Design a protein around this motif. Structure first.
Motif, short mmCIF file in Angstrom:
data_model
loop_
_atom_site.label_atom_id
_atom_site.label_comp_id
_atom_site.label_asym_id
_atom_site.label_seq_id
_atom_site.Cartn_x
_atom_site.Cartn_y
_atom_site.Cartn_z
N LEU A 33 42.22 31.45 27.86
CA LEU A 33 41.70 31.06 29.17
C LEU A 33 41.06 29.68 29.12
O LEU A 33 41.35 28.82 29.95
CB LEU A 33 40.70 32.11 29.66
CG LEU A 33 40.31 32.06 31.14
CD1 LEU A 33 41.54 32.13 32.03
CD2 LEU A 33 39.35 33.19 31.46
N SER A 73 40.87 37.80 35.37
CA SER A 73 41.52 36.66 34.71
C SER A 73 41.68 36.91 33.22
O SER A 73 42.73 36.63 32.64
CB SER A 73 40.72 35.39 34.96
OG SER A 73 40.70 35.07 36.34
N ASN A 133 47.80 37.50 39.18
CA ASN A 133 46.44 37.44 39.69
C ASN A 133 46.37 36.40 40.79
O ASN A 133 46.68 35.23 40.56
CB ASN A 133 45.45 37.10 38.57
CG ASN A 133 44.04 37.59 38.86
OD1 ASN A 133 43.81 38.30 39.84
ND2 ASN A 133 43.10 37.20 38.01
N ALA A 134 45.96 36.82 41.99
CA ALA A 134 45.79 35.93 43.12
C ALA A 134 44.39 36.13 43.69
O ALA A 134 43.96 37.27 43.90
CB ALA A 134 46.84 36.19 44.20
N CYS A 149 45.42 17.15 38.85
CA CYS A 149 44.84 18.49 38.90
C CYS A 149 43.32 18.44 39.00
O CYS A 149 42.71 19.29 39.66
CB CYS A 149 45.26 19.29 37.68
SG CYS A 149 47.04 19.58 37.56
N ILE A 154 32.72 32.32 31.34
CA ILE A 154 33.85 33.02 30.74
C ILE A 154 33.40 33.81 29.51
O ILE A 154 33.76 34.97 29.32
CB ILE A 154 34.97 32.03 30.39
CG1 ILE A 154 35.72 31.61 31.65
CG2 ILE A 154 35.93 32.63 29.36
CD1 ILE A 154 36.79 30.57 31.43
N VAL A 206 31.61 26.64 33.41
CA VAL A 206 32.74 27.56 33.56
C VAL A 206 32.99 28.29 32.25
O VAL A 206 33.18 29.51 32.23
CB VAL A 206 34.00 26.79 34.01
CG1 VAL A 206 35.18 27.74 34.13
CG2 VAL A 206 33.75 26.08 35.33
N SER A 263 38.90 21.72 45.80
CA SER A 263 38.97 23.15 46.07
C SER A 263 37.58 23.77 46.12
O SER A 263 37.26 24.54 47.04
CB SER A 263 39.83 23.85 45.02
OG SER A 263 41.15 23.33 45.03
N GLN A 264 36.73 23.46 45.14
CA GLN A 264 35.39 24.03 45.08
C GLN A 264 34.37 23.21 45.87
O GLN A 264 33.21 23.63 45.97
CB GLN A 264 34.93 24.17 43.63
CG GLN A 264 34.82 22.86 42.87
CD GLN A 264 34.49 23.07 41.41
OE1 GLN A 264 34.64 24.17 40.88
NE2 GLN A 264 34.03 22.02 40.75
N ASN A 309 36.43 37.07 37.05
CA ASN A 309 36.62 36.62 35.67
C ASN A 309 37.23 37.71 34.81
O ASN A 309 38.10 37.45 33.98
CB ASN A 309 35.29 36.15 35.08
CG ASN A 309 34.70 34.97 35.82
OD1 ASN A 309 33.54 34.99 36.22
ND2 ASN A 309 35.50 33.92 36.00
N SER A 325 44.54 22.16 31.99
CA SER A 325 45.06 21.96 33.34
C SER A 325 44.31 20.85 34.06
O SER A 325 44.92 20.04 34.76
CB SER A 325 44.97 23.26 34.13
OG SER A 325 43.62 23.58 34.42
N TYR A 329 42.37 26.24 31.13
CA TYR A 329 41.53 25.54 32.09
C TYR A 329 41.37 24.07 31.72
O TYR A 329 41.73 23.18 32.49
CB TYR A 329 40.16 26.22 32.19
CG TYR A 329 39.27 25.63 33.25
CD1 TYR A 329 39.53 25.83 34.60
CD2 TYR A 329 38.16 24.87 32.91
CE1 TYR A 329 38.72 25.29 35.57
CE2 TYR A 329 37.34 24.32 33.88
CZ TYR A 329 37.63 24.54 35.21
OH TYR A 329 36.82 24.00 36.18
N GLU A 379 42.43 17.95 42.56
CA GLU A 379 42.63 19.19 43.29
C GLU A 379 41.49 20.18 43.02
O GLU A 379 41.02 20.86 43.94
CB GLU A 379 43.98 19.80 42.91
CG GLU A 379 44.50 20.84 43.90
CD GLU A 379 43.82 22.18 43.76
OE1 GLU A 379 43.25 22.45 42.68
OE2 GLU A 379 43.86 22.97 44.72
N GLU A 380 41.05 20.28 41.77
CA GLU A 380 39.96 21.20 41.44
C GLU A 380 38.69 20.83 42.19
O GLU A 380 38.03 21.69 42.78
CB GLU A 380 39.72 21.20 39.93
CG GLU A 380 38.61 22.14 39.48
CD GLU A 380 38.97 23.60 39.64
OE1 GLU A 380 40.17 23.90 39.82
OE2 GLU A 380 38.06 24.45 39.60
N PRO A 425 53.88 32.22 28.72
CA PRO A 425 54.35 31.87 27.38
C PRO A 425 53.60 30.70 26.77
O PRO A 425 53.11 29.80 27.46
CB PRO A 425 55.82 31.50 27.63
CG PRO A 425 55.81 30.90 28.99
CD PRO A 425 54.72 31.62 29.77
#
Lengths: 55, 419, 151, 48
Positions: free
Chosen positions: B344, B253, B293-294, B357, B382, B378, B364-365, B250, B351, B348, B360-361, B263
């Motif tokens: 941030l 991020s 960041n990866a 999306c 943060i 989340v 993923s988790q 975090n 997105s 989130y 997909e989220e 932008p």
């Protein structure tokens, strides 16, 4: 909070049998367009963009 | 006002559902496969695999699959990363049964006939070429190739020397060792939970158990420099960063959004970024900078990406690097951190706003633990990022062994040992 | 322009032998500026070499002081007067280069060949020095060159 | 001794109007035929 979309970064290709490969994340070329950047991709073995599937 | 249902079956398959009211239903199968599981002997297998989603199966020919999905009007797609793969189908509520049957066949009943595979090989080259038109593709794959020794380095596209040398045997071997029940997750949006249980029961009589596992991605502080006739140089220099799930992830991020991760205003000047406002006063206006960041299961990467002119390539990098050092030196104000956190949270929630999306989220988790993590939690995490943590992340990046991947004229670009 | 495509043919024949590709990579891996330059044209420059660049290189590097002339069957006095013609050409000194700096990087390739090649070089002495002779003796102690055939 | 043609250092690409171009140098090669089976396949480029 682990997805590439949630953590912008490496490209995640979405190549499909019925739609194009437009995808990715953290692609820092769109911000450079405004500052002088005449360079644009050439049309060598290229495809359309915006993947107009849901017209 | 409906919620989601989760069930973990004895096989290991994870099921999920979220009854909505949209007249369009979407189902996704998430497999913990990717290029990280290939080896030097079978490089390029995943790239061919993601293009086989329309090949003949035991229960359905290629003709049937294509015609059936087209008549219904639905769509089928495959999304691949270095750690995961995903199949997704979208259609109307009334045609879900047929598409689920096709998805079952494709992921479970692949034939991999010789002549079909031979024909698909030409496609691979075309697919790799269209993606390499964008210079970032090549730059970042080389960056991974110059940041690891074993895993998280295998390219996402077939190497040129392996085209035409991929056999059905490798495809079958990869499927049988990775497309395993305890490694998959099925997610539905427009469908009810019990019907998912039914189709899953069809998924619980195949494969099974666990699959072959990979090795920890060792870190190598390498550099790869490419020379071409382009007037603009793309450079990326990176350092190791702890990942994932930790509060340190975090912090990274938040750090990248302090440095102008992207932008916000169309045709703006990014006045809130510390990087763009340093490069701008260092050289001419044509340039671009951002933080990178990866996050991966066993390792993470944090660095800076820059696009500049060949002559200005050197100074640009220096300026960006200097900015980070000031942060690591304790120079920070608790007013840009709040702005960074707001950026941030907005990114989130905005997105996940789209259904695609959001699916997909969840997928993923769903593989790490299967417990969904609502956005409110989340956001809570943060907001819990302190200030010393961000300075700690900056210090780690400065003191860490660096990698680099440049692509351009590289006439004035600095080497990794001169940074 | 008509001669340009020949570059590909020449380059391909040389790379047919993998040893050529390993060294040209080796020089590009141990030097930063000067000696890293490949003996063969890069792929992207094949179609873009111009006659102006050819002319510019000639004027600045074909200077008389940089040249030497050697003859074996010819007599010395006639060699003087045949060479007298170009004394109205070139002259002085040319454009100096840059001292080659050492980096120490790696360049892996990952091709499909079964037989892997490698290279393990380190900084040595300068051509025509006493230390250079010791290195010459060193390599021949390590069996640098084969002598007896099928042995 | 100041010519690398008599050393195992860099290669020396050559060209000729009538003769063909062949590189040199003395780094290990040739002696791999005895122990090994390195084939010499003809390919896109052909020269004697």
């Amino acid at each position: 909070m682990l997805s590439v979309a949630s953590r912008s970064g490496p490209f995640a290709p979405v190549l499909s049998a019925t739609s194009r490969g437009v995808a990715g994340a953290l692609r820092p070329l769109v911000q450079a367009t405004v500052p002088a950047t005449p360079e644009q991709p050439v049309l060598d073995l290229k495809r359309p963009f915006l993947s107009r599937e849901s017209l | 006002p409906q919620d989601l249902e989760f069930t973990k079956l004895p096989n290991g398959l994870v099921i999920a559902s979220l009854e909505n009211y949209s007249p369009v239903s979407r189902i996704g199968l998430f497999i913990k496969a990717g290029s990280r599981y290939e080896d030097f002997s079978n490089l390029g297998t995943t790239h061919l695999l993601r293009l086989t989603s329309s090949l003949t199966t035991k229960g359905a020919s290629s003709f049937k699959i294509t015609r059936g999905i087209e008549a219904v009007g639905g769509k089928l797609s495959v999304t691949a990363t270095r750690e995961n793969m995903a199949y997704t189908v979208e259609c109307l509520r009334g045609d879900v049964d047929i598409l689920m049957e096709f998805l079952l066949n494709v992921t479970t009943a692949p034939e991999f006939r010789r002549w079909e595979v031979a024909d698909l090989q030409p496609q691979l080259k075309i697919d790799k070429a269209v993606a390499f038109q964008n210079p970032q593709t090549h730059v970042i794959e080389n960056l991974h190739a110059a940041a690891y020794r074993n895993a998280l380095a295998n390219p996402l596209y077939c190497p040129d020397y392996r085209i035409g040398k991929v056999t059905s045997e490798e495809l079958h071997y990869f499927v049988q060792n990775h497309f395993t029940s305890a490694r998959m997750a099925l997610i539905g949006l427009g469908v009810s939970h019990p019907v998912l249980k039914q189709v899953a029961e069809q998924f619980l009589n195949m494969r099974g158990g666990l699959g072959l596992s990979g090795a920890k991605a060792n870190y190598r502080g390498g550099e790869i420099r490419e020379q071409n006739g382009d007037s603009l140089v793309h450079a990326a220099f990176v350092a190791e960063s702890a990942v994932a799930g930790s509060a340190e992830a975090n912090a990274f991020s938040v750090l990248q959004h302090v440095l102008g991760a992207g932008p916000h205003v169309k045709r703006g000047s990014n006045t809130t970024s510390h990087l763009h406002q340093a490069v701008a006063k260092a050289t001419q206006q044509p340039f671009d900078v951002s933080a990178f960041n990866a996050s991966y299961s066993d390792s993470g990467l944090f660095g800076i990406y820059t696009i500049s002119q060949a002559t200005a390539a050197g100074d640009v990098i220096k300026a960006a690097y200097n900015q980070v050092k000031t942060i690591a030196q304790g120079n920070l104000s608790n007013t840009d951190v709040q702005a960074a956190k707001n950026k941030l949270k907005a990114g989130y929630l905005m997105s996940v706003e789209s259904s695609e999306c959001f699916l997909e989220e969840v997928g993923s988790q769903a593989l790490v633990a299967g417990s969904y993590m609502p956005p409110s939690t989340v956001l809570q995490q943060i907001d819990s990022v302190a200030n010393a943590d961000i300075i700690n992340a900056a210090k780690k990046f400065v003191s860490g062994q660096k990698s680099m991947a440049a692509s351009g004229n590289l006439g004035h670009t600095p080497f990794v040992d001169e940074l």
